[PDB]
């Protein structure tokens, strides 16, 4: 449910047990409790 | 009704009884056997009269050391680094009570041991560790016979003292661990006598700083000089100051130790500074 840098992804996780409402809850909570407006290590992610 | 005298610091002290359980007996051994919820009124009636000048009196009870409210005024218990400890039994008491030792006390204004045989022929392997084991005693006549006998044996010994050094470390360490300041002073004085009594002894004691010197660190700051400022102390003759004794013993050890006694003393006691370089 999280990447290496500790963020909560964007899209639905495959075979996830939680519903969409709790996913939106977790996303908004994590955006509330962040200390910076963006990840300072975005450029080092690969896919 | 009954009265209880203070009875402290006197001829009859129960303090000296708890330590060294073997003491207290006569010249011979022990004698043969045969010789609810009561009402207390209305304490408070403040209801209906609340006001801002009131504030809480109870404020719960006690405090936990690492809780949210805090530790309050609580303090941890003392470890007792300076608390006096029990004196282990000594082999000197066994060999004197048995009668296998070559000595007697010749009374007078200056006490002296009288020897029933010439000292130079004694087997120091068998005697010298037994006399150092008697330094720990705190009851007459043992204190005198042990410490004066130690001084006499060291003074007249000669070249045979040197191989005895490995056997003397345990009595030296056990004397210092008792945390009795007078025993510490006697041990330090005898150590000062031992260091210079012969040759190549200081170099032999370098590997054994790991066992002796730990007790030096604890007592290097204790001082009896309670006089204020420039007042002189008239009890200097007794040499009962622990700190001066331990400092001068450390300096004597570094000077007679040899090539690398400094790095060992500096590893044992941290505040020491090199005398020679």
């Amino acid at each position: 449910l999280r990447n290496s840098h500790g963020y909560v992804h964007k899209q639905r996780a495959l075979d996830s047990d939680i519903d969409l409402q709790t996913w939106r809850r977790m996303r908004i909570i994590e955006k509330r409790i962040d200390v910076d407006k963006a990840d300072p290590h975005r450029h080092k992610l690969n896919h | 009704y009954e009265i209880q005298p203070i009875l402290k610091g006197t001829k009859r002290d129960p303090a000296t009884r708890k330590y060294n359980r073997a003491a207290g007996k006569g010249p011979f051994g022990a004698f043969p056997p045969g010789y609810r919820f009561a009402y207390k009124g209305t304490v408070q009636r403040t209801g209906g009269t609340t006001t801002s000048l009131y504030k809480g009196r109870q404020q719960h009870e006690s405090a936990v050391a690492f809780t949210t409210n805090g530790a309050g005024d609580s303090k941890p218990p003392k470890a007792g680094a300076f608390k006096r400890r029990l004196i282990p039994p000594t082999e000197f008491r066994r060999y004197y009570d048995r009668g296998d030792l070559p000595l007697s006390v010749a009374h007078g204004n200056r006490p002296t041991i009288d020897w029933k045989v010439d000292v130079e022929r004694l087997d120091y392997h068998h005697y010298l560790p037994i006399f150092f084991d008697g330094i720990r005693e705190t009851e007459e006549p043992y204190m005198f016979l042990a410490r004066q006998g130690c001084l006499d044996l060291l003074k007249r010994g000669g070249p045979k003292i040197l191989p005895t050094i490995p056997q003397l470390i345990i009595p030296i360490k056990t004397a210092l661990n008792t945390r009795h300041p007078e025993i510490i002073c006697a041990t330090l004085r005898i150590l000062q006598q031992l260091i210079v009594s012969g040759d190549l002894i200081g170099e032999a004691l370098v590997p054994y700083y790991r066992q002796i010197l730990p007790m030096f660190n604890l007592f290097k700051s204790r001082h009896k000089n309670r006089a204020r400022g420039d007042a002189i102390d008239f009890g200097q003759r007794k040499r009962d100051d622990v700190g001066d004794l331990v400092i001068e013993t450390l300096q004597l050890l570094e000077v007679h130790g040899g090539d690398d006694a400094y790095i060992n003393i500096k590893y044992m006691v941290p505040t020491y500074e090199s005398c020679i370089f």
Binding site: - | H223, G229, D230, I232, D233, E273, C275
Partner: protein, 185 residues
């Protein structure tokens, strides 16, 4: 303080013998102690200033920080025994240009330094008992190029045994000193 006194020959303000040796001195002692003890080498009473920290434990003169000694004699002579550990002392003087200057000496200083308020300089002490003769006029002339008028503060730091501190108007030989000033082994 000594401004209105008679100042000629020898003027001494410290002496271990006496009812109140530290009468005109103030003590600032932490992690240390000061006391009067009998010395083994010379068999007489001496003062001892010993502490774990060199800077914290010291004795000053005069007691009130706003007072000045006001002594015009050029030389300062000390009687100090070396205990094979760190030691230092200060003297504050006044020149004819009206500037208060300090002279600090110690056996742990790495380099001699001159700055407008301080000269710091190295020192050694020989083995045993030592007498240190200090020329304020020569050191002032050599350091600042300015004449010497008076001293107005004396300090002493741990660790060192002391018997007497006195001023003199010139150097004296061993036999020219009065008996009470000369030390005997």
């Amino acid at each position: 303080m000594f401004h209105n006194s008679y100042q000629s020959g020898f003027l001494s303000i410290l002496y271990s013998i006496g009812s109140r040796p530290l009468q005109i001195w103030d003590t600032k002692v932490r992690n240390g102690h000061v006391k009067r003890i009998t010395d083994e080498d010379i068999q007489s009473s001496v003062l001892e200033v010993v502490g774990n920290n060199v800077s914290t434990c010291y004795i000053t003169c005069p007691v009130d920080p706003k007072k000045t000694l006001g002594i015009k004699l050029p030389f300062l002579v000390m009687i100090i025994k070396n205990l094979k550990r760190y030691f230092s002392f200060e003297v504050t003087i006044l020149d004819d240009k009206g500037i208060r200057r300090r002279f600090r000496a110690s056996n742990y200083q790495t380099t001699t330094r001159v700055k407008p308020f301080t000269c710091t300089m190295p020192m050694r002490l020989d083995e045993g008992w030592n007498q240190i003769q200090f020329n304020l006029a020569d050191f002032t002339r050599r350091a600042y190029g300015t004449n010497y008028l008076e001293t107005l503060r004396v300090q002493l730091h741990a660790n060192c045994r002391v018997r007497r501190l006195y001023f003199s108007d010139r150097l004296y030989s061993e036999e020219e000193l009065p008996p009470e000033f000369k030390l005997f082994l």
